[PDB]
Each structure stands twice: as C-alpha cells, then as structure tokens.
C-alpha cells in the first residue's frame, strides 16, 4: 500500500531543499567524470573504478549511448544512472522518434531527462536521484553540444566542464586549456591530461572509459544502400585507441 | 538514531527487523503445538488451555485443514493463524483449478512463505503473530514444515512452537535418535500425545484439552483427519502412564 503520497523533499526555513543538497553531496563524492567540446566533435570521459580486480570492468559501462548521436556519463550513484539511461532511451523513442521519425536533438532529450529528475524532487514517496550527468551530442540544426544535468532537474550547457571529486581542480585546469578553435583530437588530448591529475592508480585504456560525438561512422551502421543514412556520430574508444594516444 | 523498532519494514543498524522480532514474542507466548513426520504421513497436536469449566469440551477446534490433504496448526495470535489459512486455502484452490493436481506440500509451503514475507516489506502492515506447523501427503510422500513470522520455513522431522517448545524439541530429538529407521503413524500419534503432556508442565496451573490429527497414506489414505474416539483415548492413556 503506497501510503507515501506526500513529498519527501521539502523547503527548510532557510529556503534549502535538503534532499537536493544531499544528493549533490553524493555526487561530489562520486568519481570524476568530464566532458569537453571541440568544433568538429565532443568528448566525454571518466575513470573506471574496479571494485575487485576479479570484476570485469568492460561489463561496466559508465559511458552510455542514448541515441546514435548522443552519449552520457555521470558521477554519483551508478544504479540511479543505470535506470536513468533506460528511461532516457525510452523517452527518446516514445516522445520523439515515434512521432517525428527522427531522433531528438540534444537539448530536447536533456529536457526530458531533467524532467524525470525534477519529478523525483517533488512527487510523492521518492527521493531525488543521486547523480549528475554530462550529456553530449550532435543534431543537424544545433550542431555539437554538451549539457550537465543535476539532481534538482537543472541543466546548463558548457564548453567544457567536470563533475565529481576532482571537479574544482579540473574545471580550473580546463579553463586554462580550452579555446574555441580546438579540434577533436586536441580535446581528447586534454581530456586525458585532465583526468590523469585526478587519478593515482594505474592510468590506461583498461581503467579509463571514453567516448566521442564525431563524424558519422558508416562502418558501424550495419547496412548499406541508403545514401541518406550515415552512421552513428557516437563511438566508444577501445582500450587500444586510448593507449595509442598515451604516447603524445 | 533510535526507534528502529517502531515501524515494520525498517532495518536496524545491525541488520534486523525488530517488529518481526516482537511478533516472535507473541508466538513464544502462545500455547504449545507440534508436528511429527512418520514414514508415510504426519501428525499434528496442540495444547488447548481450559480457561474455565464453562468451555464446551471437544468444541474449539484449533487445527485447520487445507484442501483435503494438508493440515495446519499454529501457536500465537489465533486470529492471525486463521487469516493465514484462509489465504492458504485460496492459494491451494487457485493452484488446483489451474493445474488440476492438488497442491504439492513444498509448493504450498512457499505459498505461505511468500505471503508472510510480504508482511515484512511495508510499514503499513504488521507481521504475522504466529508460527505455523503444517504438512501432508503429496505424490512424493510426507512433508512437515514450520513457518515463522519472518517467512522463514524449512522441512522438519519434527517441529514445535509456543511456550512448551524446548521440552518438546528435546523430546523430539529423542525420537529422532531412538527411531532412526522411521516411526509408524499410530506410534507417532501416541508420542505426540505424550509430548504435549510433557510440554504442558511449564504451566500445570491451567487444565488443558488435547487435540491431534493425522494425514497418513495407509491409515487415513493421504487425506487429513482428526483423531477421535478410541484412538484418541488410547493415546491419552499412553501419555498418562508415560508421566509416572
């Protein structure tokens, strides 16, 4: 019997909403992830945090495809992320693709996620989600973009940013390095540096997860014959592709 | 914090659910009841305390039957026990309506299990105030189960619960060791009478009526039946002489 038809997030006398604040604290404690936007692409990245060396970390995706042109990453409570990813993929279909026969543009999909998050901040009998997401994508009329979504439901666009533990440091580090002529390869280079500060264990393609929103990949489409469907712009990098770049 | 024990679905910091623990007290506090598996059937018995001479003897029957082949008996809050059987009966009817075959005893145990465990999941409900001993004869022979307010249940050679549970448990442990080969139904009936008389000695202060039933392949035909008349007398006799 769900008795709990009342909000569990309420205004304190000072004007705070404790549960949103506390969610943010859970996020702050989470592992660093970050994203950065070039001119011909966007990259998002985070640290895999193997809980045993007996676990297979490939079976933990911290970086997720949402649509062929849109990906996500998070800091905070991974389970809350897992179900937000399921939810977000579904809403991209039911509230967009099934209507207009094309995938939603980045900012609209972000609204939808944001909205879900807001609802857990006000509806009966639930707590807010304990995550922040960075969402990166591309769409024909807005180009490349990067958004941050917070437990409150608020989102905002960024040229680059970071969330989780080392984020104040890393945001500082990104301000030094970001320009508006960055090409995608260069942003990857920077992402890898900025991550490397925030991590003292082994640092390589097995302990790092990383994806890009780039050119379309027709080799990853699965079929040929329709010149108007080019591949997904989203792509995870391989353990290899990463180490390759750890030369530069 | 404190007050981990005020609400029902709540874990204390040591990992426990104090309201279920308190329900066990309501059970420990009830009258004694037991089950004995013989080697083609099972036997149930239960102490009925006689408050007053104004009770009608014979007539406040505490063992309940489910379907045709299952007996249940319970110690604790009696109305909760009855509520649980009403559920059990719906479950057995639904199972039989769909699958034709009368419900197998393990299948039926898990039905009660799940329903009881369900009352430890939510704060808007209160855990069951009974331990239930039950069983019968299915197509794989006899089965005896016992089921706690938490929804824990297992299979038993014998089982007891209520005030008398320790004298009964000790007494059953005897039987297991001093009859490794198995026990016949008619002998298990008499033993059951004995064991109730032995466990009654915790509160001799009150007078009591004995009630026994059995489900046995050879003796009752795999159906559940109460023991009465001559056979009931004969088992009360065996209990008197085993006291002196």
């Amino acid at each position: 019997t769900d008795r709990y038809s009342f909000s569990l997030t309420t205004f304190s006398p000072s004007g705070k909403l404790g549960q949103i604040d506390y969610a943010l604290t859970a996020v702050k404690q989470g592992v660093t992830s970050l994203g950065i936007k070039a001119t011909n692409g966007v990259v998002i990245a985070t640290e895999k945090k193997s809980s045993s060396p007996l676990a297979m970390s490939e079976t933990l995706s911290k970086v997720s495809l949402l649509t062929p042109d849109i990906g996500a990453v998070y800091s905070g409570m991974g389970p809350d992320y897992r179900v937000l990813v399921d939810k977000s993929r579904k809403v991209a279909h039911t509230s967009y693709k099934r209507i207009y026969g094309e995938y939603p543009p980045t900012k609209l999909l972000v609204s939808e996620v944001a909205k879900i998050m807001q609802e857990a901040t006000q509806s009966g009998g639930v707590r807010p989600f304990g995550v922040s997401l960075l969402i990166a994508g591309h769409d024909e009329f807005n180009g490349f973009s990067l958004y941050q979504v917070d437990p409150s439901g608020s989102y905002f666009p960024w040229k680059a940013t970071a969330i989780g533990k080392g984020s104040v440091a890393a945001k500082t580090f990104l301000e030094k390095r970001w320009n508006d002529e960055l090409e995608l390869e260069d942003a990857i280079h920077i992402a890898l540096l900025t991550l490397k500060e925030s991590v003292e264990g082994e640092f390589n393609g097995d302990t790092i997860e990383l994806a890009i929103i780039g050119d379309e990949n027709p080799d990853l489409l699965g079929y040929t014959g329709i010149p108007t469907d080019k591949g997904p712009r989203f792509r995870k990098l391989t353990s290899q592709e990463i180490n390759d770049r750890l030369e530069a | 914090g404190t007050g981990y024990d005020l609400s029902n679905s709540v874990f204390s910091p040591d990992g426990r659910n104090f309201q279920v623990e308190y329900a066990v007290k309501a059970v420990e506090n009830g009258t004694t009841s037991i089950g004995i598996k013989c080697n083609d059937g099972v036997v149930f018995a239960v102490e009925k305390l006689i408050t007053s001479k104004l009770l009608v003897p014979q007539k406040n029957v505490k063992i309940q039957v489910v379907d045709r082949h299952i007996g249940c008996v319970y110690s604790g809050l009696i109305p909760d026990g009855r509520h649980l059987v009403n559920r059990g009966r719906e479950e057995a009817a639904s199972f039989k309506k769909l699958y034709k075959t009368p419900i197998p005893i393990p299948a039926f145990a898990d039905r009660l299990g799940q329903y009881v465990q369900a009352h430890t999941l939510y704060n808007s409900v209160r855990p069951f105030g009974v331990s239930t001993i039950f069983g019968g004869v299915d197509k794989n022979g006899a089965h005896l189960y016992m089921l706690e307010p938490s929804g824990s249940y297992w299979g038993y050679k014998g089982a007891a619960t209520g005030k008398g549970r320790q004298s009964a448990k000790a007494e059953l442990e005897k039987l297991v060791d001093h009859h490794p080969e198995g026990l016949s139904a008619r002998e298990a009936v008499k033993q059951a009478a004995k064991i109730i008389y032995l466990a009654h000695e915790d509160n001799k202060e009150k007078d009591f009526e004995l009630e026994i039933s059995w489900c046995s392949l050879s003796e009752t035909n795999g159906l559940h039946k109460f023991v009465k008349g001559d056979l009931l007398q004969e088992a009360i006799d065996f209990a008197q002489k085993e006291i002196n």
Partner: protein, 242 residues
C-alpha cells in the same frame, strides 16, 4: 534522524537503510563462491544445519531459476525466496515475449533495477540479500553476475560472498595473477568443482564432509545442483592429492 529509517539521503549523501541491508546479508554466516571453467560455471556454498530436527534436504540457498540460470543467495531465506521467485517469473516472461532464453547478465540487470527501486521509493524496503547468477551463456560463455541491495551489478571472472569473503577473494586474486587467465583451464566440470572446493578449503582453513556443502553447475544448456553423493565423489578425488 528518519533519514535512518527510510530510503532518503542523509546529509552525507547516504542511504543508511541500504547500508543496514548489506549488513543483513551476513546473518546466515555462510560463504559462497563462484568460478568459471572452459565451458562451465560452478558455485559452492556452505551448508549448515544447526538443528537435528530439520530435514536437511530442504536447506538450500541455491536456486534453479531457469533451464540455464542458477542463483545463489547470500542472506536470509525469506528474502532469498522472494528474489528467487521473482527471477523465475522474469526469466519465463522474457522467454515468452522475446523468443529466447533469458541471459544471466540481463536477468541480473533486471533484478538489480528492481533493487534500485527500493532505494529510491520509500514504502519499499531493500531486500537483505546478494544474488550471484551463473550460467553458460550462448553469446557470452560461462558467466557470473552479482547483485546487491544498492542496485549494483557487475560481471566476474570469479567471486565470493559472505563474512569470510575477503579471505576467499584474496586467495582467488592470487591464483589468477599466477595463472594469467580469467578461468580455470579445465575441460571437465567435475575438476572445476574440485578446484573450487580446494581453493576454498585453503582460504577458510577448514575441512568439509559431504553434508557441509552445496554445489551448483552450469553447463551449456543446463544448470543443476549436486547430491551429497556426486559431491562425495569430488571430496574423494581431492583426497587422492593429499
């Protein structure tokens, strides 16, 4: 603090009811472990029968979920059975709808998502259990997937759960550092069971009769448990290497 009684955030960003549910998993004082062979997956669990009145054959924390999936549970039996039933139901419904047998990792994912919900919704309590699913998947090979009350899940090369989990885990970590591979290199499941029991006796420092264990085995297209006798066979084999 009622942030202690229901699944809402403490000021540190914590769900104490989730933490306390983890604690409950250890109430049985049973350790379990799972490992992978070339084409099998084995789980082993202690089996304790304190009472002389219990029917021993009914005492089990291992479940046949489907034709192909086995689950072993660390934690109290009522919650174990509730999760078992649920997973049985899910695996069967999945087959009916999508036309193929539900995979281990997907079932784990689903069961984890159910747990996640109890951490977010208030009238539901987390279950005090940790589920370890095993199969030989037709796409993925022998696989182990573990779920807890946080809603967390991951795949494993091998794993172990319970009070003495740490001992067992470090023992296995060591074995694979040497062996350089992620599985027991063994054709026969009878020897992967032997390996598993062995590497467990050494980690717990304790000897086992045939009634001290439960075993489950996943071959391609069947998951089954052993009887005291098929176990006894294994304990005799181990003894032949003193």
């Amino acid at each position: 603090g009622y942030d202690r009684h229901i699944t809402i955030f403490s000021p540190e960003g914590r769900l104490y009811q989730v933490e306390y549910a983890f604690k409950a998993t250890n109430q049985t004082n049973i350790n379990s472990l799972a490992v992978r062979g070339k084409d099998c997956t084995v789980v082993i669990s202690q089996k304790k029968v304190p009472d002389k009145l219990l029917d021993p054959t009914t005492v089990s924390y291992i479940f046949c979920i489907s034709r192909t999936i086995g689950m072993v549970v660390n934690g109290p039996i009522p919650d174990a059975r509730n999760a078992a039933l649920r997973a049985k139901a899910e695996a069967a419904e999945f087959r009916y709808k999508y036309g193929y047998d539900m995979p281990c990792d997907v079932l784990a994912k689903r069961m984890a998502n159910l747990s996640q919900i109890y951490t977010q919704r208030a009238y539901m309590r987390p279950l005090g259990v940790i589920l370890t699913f095993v199969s030989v998947d037709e796409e993925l090979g022998p696989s182990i997937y573990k779920t807890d009350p946080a809603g967390y899940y991951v795949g494993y090369k091998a794993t172990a759960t319970g009070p003495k989990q740490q001992e067992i885990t470090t023992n296995l970590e060591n074995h694979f550092k040497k062996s350089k591979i992620d599985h027991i290199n063994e054709e026969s499941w009878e020897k992967v069971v032997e390996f598993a029991i062995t590497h467990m006796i050494d980690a717990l420092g304790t000897e086992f009769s045939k009634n001290d264990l439960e075993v489950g085995v996943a071959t391609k297209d069947k998951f089954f448990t052993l009887s005291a006798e098929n176990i006894e066979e294994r304990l005799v084999a181990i003894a032949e290497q003193d």
